[PDB]
Ligand binder design. Sequence first.
Ligand SMILES: O=c1ccn([C@@H]2O[C@H](COP(=O)(O)OP(=O)(O)O[C@H]3O[C@H](CO)[C@@H](O)[C@H](O)[C@H]3O)[C@@H](O)[C@H]2O)c(=O)[nH]1
Ligand SMILES: [Mn+2]
Length: 537
Amino acid sequence: SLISKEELIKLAYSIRPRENEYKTILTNLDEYNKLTTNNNENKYLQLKKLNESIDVFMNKYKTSSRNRALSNLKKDILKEVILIKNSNTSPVEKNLHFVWIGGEVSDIALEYIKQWADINAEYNIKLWYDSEAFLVNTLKKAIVESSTTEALQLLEEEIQNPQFDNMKFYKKRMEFIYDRQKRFINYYKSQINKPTVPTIDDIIKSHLVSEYNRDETVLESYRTNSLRKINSNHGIDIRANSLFTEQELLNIYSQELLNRGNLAAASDIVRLLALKNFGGVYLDVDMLPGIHSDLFKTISRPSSIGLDRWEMIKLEAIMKYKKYINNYTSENFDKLDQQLKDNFKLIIESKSEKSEIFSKLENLNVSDLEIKIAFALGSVINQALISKQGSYLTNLVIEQVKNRYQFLNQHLNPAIESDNNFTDTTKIFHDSLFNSATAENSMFLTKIAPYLQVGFMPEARSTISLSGPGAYASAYYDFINLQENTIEKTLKASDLIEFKFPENNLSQLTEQEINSLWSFDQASAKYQFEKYVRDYT
Ligand SMILES: O=c1ccn([C@@H]2O[C@H](COP(=O)(O)OP(=O)(O)O[C@H]3O[C@H](CO)[C@@H](O)[C@H](O)[C@H]3O)[C@@H](O)[C@H]2O)c(=O)[nH]1
Ligand SMILES: [Mn+2]
C-alpha cells in the first residue's frame, strides 16, 4: 500500500503554501488508500490518476522542494502496481491455444501438440485455423518460386562471379514478388464483393489455375484434405467464433493474410483475439512442455557446451530413448563423449511414464490485469503466452497493435495506391513516413520502413514492431509505468521478471523452433541463394 495523506504532508513539508496541484495529489492519494474494493482494474486506474497528478505538479513546479518526497512516492507506486497484479490471483482458463493458418497442418506440429495434450488432459486444445485460406501458402510458394526464376534469368549472367552480392538477387526478386502480389490483390478486389460471395480460397484457386497453370481438382483436394485434417485434430475456425469483433482487426489480419502473405503476423493477431475472448495459454506449434526441473541435476554440463546447447541436448536425449517424436534430431547429443551419453541413457530409460519426464502445467495462477510471456536473448518473445480472458494488459497489447498499424497504413496506403513498382512504392512510403519522424517515434519508424520486404528478404523484421514482441514490450512499459500509447520505449527481459512465462513450464529450444517461417537470416540467405542457383543449373 501507499503512505497516508498525513504522512505525505510531513515528508513534503514546505515553508511555502500548498499549490493547488499538490492539494490534488494529496486528494488522489487519500482517495486511493481509502479505496474499498477488490476490483484490480479499479485500483490500477486510481494509481494511474494519482501518478499523473504527481507528474503534473512536478513538471510545473520543477523547483519545488516537495519533489524529492514526490519522486519517492512515484517509486512506491511502481511497486504498488506489482502488488495489485500479484493479488486476486487464480488459475487461467484451462485452454491450450494453437494457431495454424494457410495450409495443411503438419504431422510434426501435431506431434508437438500431442505432447502438450498428453501431459495436460484437463486442458482444452484449440487449434485455430482460417476455413477460407487453406490455399494461401500455395499462392505464396507459387509467387516466390516464379519470382525466383525470373530474377535468376535476369541475373543469369552475373550470379556466379565471386563478388556477386547475393543481395542483388534479393532486391531484384522482390520487385517481381511485389508485382505478383499487386496482381493477385487486384484480382481479389475485383471478386470479393460479387453477389456470388466467393471465399478467399475460391479466388486464390481461380488465380492459380489461370495465372500459374495449376490444376483445380488437385487444389480442391488439397483444400478439403487440409480442412478434413485440421478438424480431426482440435481444429476450430476463427471465422465462426467471433474473434474479429470489429472491421479494424479483420482488416489488419487480412492485410497480413492476403497482401503480405505473412502467416506468422496473421497468427500474431489471432492469438491476441483468442486470448482476449477465451483466456488460457497460447503456444506456437514448435514449443514443447517444460522438462522436470530436477530430472537432470545429477549430470553436470561440460564447460565447453554453452547453456542453450545444453538445454537442446537434454531434449535430444529424452527423444533418443523415448522417441516421443520421430525422428528427433540427435546431432548435438551424439557429439557427447560416451560416459555422458550413458548417464542420459540410464536416467531417461529408468523413468516409466511421459508423466514424469515433462512437467504438467497444472494451475497457472495469474491476475486479471496481466499477460505472461516467454523470454529469449534479452527480449520478450510471444511464442508462449498466458492470459485470463479479457485481461487489461492483453487489451493494452491489442491497442498497441492497432495504433501501430494505423500509423503504418496512414503512410503505406497511398504509396501502394500509386501502383508504382516496388522501388518507387518504397520511396513514396518512406518520404511520407520519415517526414513525420520525431525523437520519440524515430526508432519505430526505422523498424517498419522495410515492411513490404518482410518474408522475402533477409533481415526484414518489421513484424516485431507491428504485431509481434515490440508491441507487447511497449504494452508492458505502459502498464508498469502507468503510461499510455508508448511508442519509444520497450521493456526487456531484465525488466519483466514479474511477467515471465514460468521457466519450468516451457521448452523453447525445440528442433522445430530452430528455424523460422516468416523470416530468415543473412547466412541462410547466402545459403538459400546457393540452393537456388545450384538448382537452377
Ligand atoms: O505457415 C504458417 C507459418 C506460421 N504460422 C504461425 O506462426 C507461428 C510462429 O511461426 P514460426 O515458424 O515459429 O516463426 P518464428 O520465427 O519462431 O516467429 C516469431 O516471430 C513471429 C512474428 O512476431 C511470432 O508470430 C512468433 O510467435 C515468434 O516466435 C506458428 O506457430 C503459426 O501459428 C502459421 O500459422 N502458418
Ligand atoms: Mn518458432
